[PDB]
Symmetry: D2
Subunit: 391 residues, 4 copies
């Protein structure tokens, strides 16, 4: 039923108004026909009645309903991009004197938000290994307000044991807010809220949009946390434009047919790479032997198309250039989750610098691939030609 849910999510008649898709209602001012009307809207301004564009229009409410049904939440808070949803969801719950506990595999800007913004506001952050599981109790302080997960991890793709972490956190700091950047799973391949996580955050920019042309962050919250996140994010003026909400809603419609192709293609490339003479290791959550694969197999209902592998060699600059500058199909760029395939390289030194309190365990150049919707054999061909350029 996921495919059916996706097609229908948020498409109530009060939002579509005769069309198939939600209307696009562009507004700041929302007009009250009367003082009574204005009073009614005012009491329901956080409850899907038209009140002010900053709180949203029909189009925003449609997307919010859809995200709440897809991720099993009480509310969905919207932001101009994923990095805004992370920074602002964390800010919404902290105060001076708090502690933040974040996976050391967190997306780099999520780490930087912590080390550069929070630290000057009297909030401390420390970090843990993604495979720590129930041993995360070691790192929990009496002032731990936030435990921030990302499964699979950015770049190196380690999958957490979420149930073990959650049980540990609840037993030691029940007041903590547990958050996850669940972008890799597009929110639907790993039902974070069903595991006792409080807030599931996405760079909706990625798979939800699906086309590399609109930026939006979402935070689906359980009932415990929705009001605080919603009201504090509002005080920060966080919102997303109506047209971007429309396009994200529209992305959901093909999310299933897309994710199934990204899964099938990326796993095939990964299986091929793992057997390649020029390849040291492959980090793909779906691949047997990858870090946390057991958790992926147990806790997820699918895979997306982002993963990485480690070359046997550490490429020098000339080799790096010969490798990356000559691809026919893979493009160099940041972000992922679109229809096209992307490639990026990270040297182990670069990764060592964004693994706080951790230790890197590879020495070759790491290549991150996003496998899009091109023919998978064309993409294999392209990688095979790349391996020839560096033998």
């Amino acid at each position: 039923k996921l495919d059916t849910q996706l097609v229908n999510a948020g498409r109530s008649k009060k939002y579509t108004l005769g069309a198939v898709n939600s209307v696009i209602q562009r507004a700041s001012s929302l007009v009250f026909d009367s003082v009574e009307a204005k009073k009614h809207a005012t009491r329901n301004r956080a409850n899907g009645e038209l009140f002010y564009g900053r709180r949203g229009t029909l189009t925003h409410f449609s997307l919010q309903q859809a995200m709440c049904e897809l991720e099993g939440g009480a509310g969905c808070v919207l932001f101009p991009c994923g990095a805004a949803a992370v920074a602002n969801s964390i800010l919404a719950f902290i105060e001076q004197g708090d502690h933040v506990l974040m996976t050391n595999t967190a997306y780099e800007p999520s780490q930087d938000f912590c080390s550069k913004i929070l630290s000057k506001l009297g909030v401390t952050t420390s970090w843990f290994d993604p495979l720590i599981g129930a041993d995360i109790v070691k790192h929990l302080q009496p002032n731990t307000k936030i435990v921030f997960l990302e499964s699979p991890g950015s770049i190196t793709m380690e999958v957490h044991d979420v149930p073990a972490i959650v049980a540990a956190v609840r037993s030691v700091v029940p007041d903590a807010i547990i958050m996850i950047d669940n972008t890799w799973a597009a929110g639907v391949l790993f039902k974070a809220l069903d595991f006792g996580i409080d807030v599931s955050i996405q760079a909706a920019t990625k798979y939800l949009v699906g086309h590399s042309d609109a930026m939006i962050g979402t935070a689906v919250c359980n009932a415990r946390c929705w009001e605080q996140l919603r009201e504090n994010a509002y005080l920060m003026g966080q919102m997303v434009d109506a047209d971007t909400a429309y396009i994200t809603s529209r992305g959901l419609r093909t999310l299933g047919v897309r994710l199934r192709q990204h899964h099938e293609s990326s796993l095939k490339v990964a299986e091929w790479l793992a057997e390649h003479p020029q390849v040291a290791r492959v980090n793909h959550p779906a691949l047997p032997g990858s870090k946390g694969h057991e958790f992926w197999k147990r806790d997820f209902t699918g895979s997306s198309g982002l993963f990485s592998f480690v070359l046997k060699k550490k490429l020098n600059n000339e080799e790096l250039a010969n490798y990356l500058d000559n691809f026919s199909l893979f493009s160099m760029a940041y972000s992922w989750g679109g229809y096209e395939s992307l490639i990026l390289a990270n040297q182990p030194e670069h990764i060592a610098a964004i693994r706080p309190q951790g230790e890197i365990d590879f020495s070759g150049t790491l290549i991150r691939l996003h496998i899009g919707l091109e023919d998978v054999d064309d993409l294999i061909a392209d990688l095979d030609a790349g391996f020839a350029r560096i033998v």
Copy 2:
């Protein structure tokens, strides 16, 4: 030359590409043709070279150039709405232990951001009377990091003596960042940076857009402050979508013909109201006798169309309804700065609650009007019929 500047602002060929208007480049991923290319973009990622959608596309850079030329700045930082530009421009400059000094006439959500978000981050806020001028030294602490102005003030429309406040602030706390919400002036009727203000902030939502259908905040910064605001806002993931940037750029083109009509019409209504038997006072910066009018006349090059007046009576609920529910032309709604005319009422109690460390000096119902582009005599007719409903 303002009219000419507005027509041409940010319309360089590298942005328009053969068209009259800037292109609309929707993107998250921006592609690097080579490793060298990627290195060059990386060093120039805050300097108008394509790097990542979060930093912006051609369309964002075009708007940023235009805002910088119109307000005489080193840089323009973009946000999803005005409330986001205020909250995030202030956050960008504070740390735990700082003090914020804000006019007590500041837009309510700007005050709330302070009292509800900053206070829990160990930052204190206090407030001053808008007409305080050089006497603001009274309120300056050795830890005052931000002095936040809004001229004219929200709702009651008091105009600051900006030169006197700035001189006082500089002489006592030279390290302070002086900020203004300059939305009423659309940034161009009061050249805030030329007065020694560090950051000029707009709800671009208002006059810059001009049509009540796109939300966007801007912060034009001098060279002293641009980097910090830009980089810290980025760490908060602040941005605006490409299409909204396009539409804001497009708004500028008619900004002059619009503002001239809002000035001419609103002043005529104000002159009429000031002579009306049912009216106690009129708060219009352009009107002789209004609070700070002398400063407006000296420091501004024009007026917009937002102002307020005070009824001789304090309307009861039945009267409020009879008055507001029966207008033909004025609509009830929040925001302003569009092509249409709006009306809102505030009771003195409501205003008393958002004037921290101040004292209200009126007792009748306050009516805030936004005078749009309708025929001014039609709008007078509509108000005259409204006065008949409450005699």
Copy 3:
């Protein structure tokens, strides 16, 4: 009740705005019927503003249509992908093989070319008339004249028709003719075509109504007589415009008064200054005495827009033309006009003689067409003035 109030409010009923200030943007091809009964009711009202199929329009189209009928005083508005589409398709909707089309020889070139290249091969003939022919138009009417096509002011050369005299003459000989006008210069509002007994007022909404040179759309506002046939026959050619464009056009109306007053004030000031300039032979601005049909402009129009032309005393050679046109700081070379920015275009008399069928030109120097936008008028005059310095 004044035009500015009309412009702000046109089309903005709550059934289209749904709480917002502007109409909603309803993007759709499929429109869903909740029941057989609902489907049957929508079928009955499919050309009557009930959601039935995207090709017939959505709420966003209905809003614009309502606003256009209000502004031009029409019974209906038919929408098209651009001005040229509204012209070609409004003519096509009323003709049959064996009909005759009578068109002003000052008509926009593609409108003439549609007649001469498309209609001719469908057994429909066209002839042309001088825009100042007035009551003597009777001389050009045939038994089979189906359409009389006006454009006032004319394209490029700006001649104003004596519309009352023309309309009275046509009605006296072929009362059942379809009289159409390309009313783009006036933006449908500075000249109220339907009050003058014209059947169809056509605009490239691309120009003034949109106002920003970034969307294309044609409109045809019809009296009650002609609406059904134009609408149904335009529908059979699949003519429509996208919902977003309809939104932007409605949004354009909002500032149309403040923009046109500026275009009027500025262009008139530039035209007066050009009239006094030694390098200028003649100025073709409808608002200016000595301009063809000025007298009809004064009587029949309530304003001027920003488009006009003037004739140089010299006929520039290619080198002087480049010198002149290549070195402007504020005027740009471009087609279209009706936007916020100022534009310049040169035409040699030989070029204009070639698109004046069955008529003669009245000038021999280089003709410059100006669009005066919203820039400072003195900056614009300084730019023009430096141009003259380049060709003395």
Copy 4:
């Protein structure tokens, strides 16, 4: 080189993307010339992908056009505001008074109506042929036959043409005929019309190419023979589409393979289950044996999309029709199809007989047309199954 790779990359050259993954959206009517020389060069290349005027298109149009020529193997793509506009205007671009149009009687109703209501009054006649006539089409050719109009599978009833036999027969008698096809069902890609010797492949891009039921656009991909005349004559009717829509259509291509594979797999599964259902008399799915022209589908197509129909054993009365159609949970009633969602439409044999000129229908029960979208196929079968329960 496979279709999926093609789809992801079609039209995405750097001169159109400018650093982004997708083409830029260039909204424009005016396109600015920096000099007389630049203006002269743009004039020369105005139908050749150089920015000249918005009506000819911007970078966003050129990108789509390139992608369409690549996908359908054409020399050019002409763009139109909707499918119906691409049909009416592609036919109009090639005819003259005294020509004859020969069209399949299974052609989309508005395509027939254009012929019978518009072309007839311009001295152009039309006749119709059974979609299975194959090589016997020679029998319907006239000395003056200018156009032969195919649609395969046919609208509603889904009959597949034996295109090779038809094309060979037409070429043997009137080699200079213009053969056109409405190729919307195949999305231009499951049947490569131009490899079959057809001159013009027309789509309502509104359907599969856009894929989401929220933009309207027509395309006509032309061989080298026919491109200029279709393009220039379509230009004279002011035919274009807005830049944003062109963007969205190009963006639609990106997911067209993953969507069509799903539509194929799901619709085939539903069609097989319907074939076995007791309340079902016949299933018209091209992919299914016993369906008219299935044999030509198997030989000539590389896939199926999600649109098909089936015929009930009963002819439903009005009460049963309401009962059936009014109570679906996942299927919606709507026109158009080719989107992500599932749709249902009923037609009575009397309705279809009325739009089958010069031919007979082959069924007598109620005909149901299904669009199978991206929902779970078993959920869809449960919805259909509950429907049958409502009319047993």
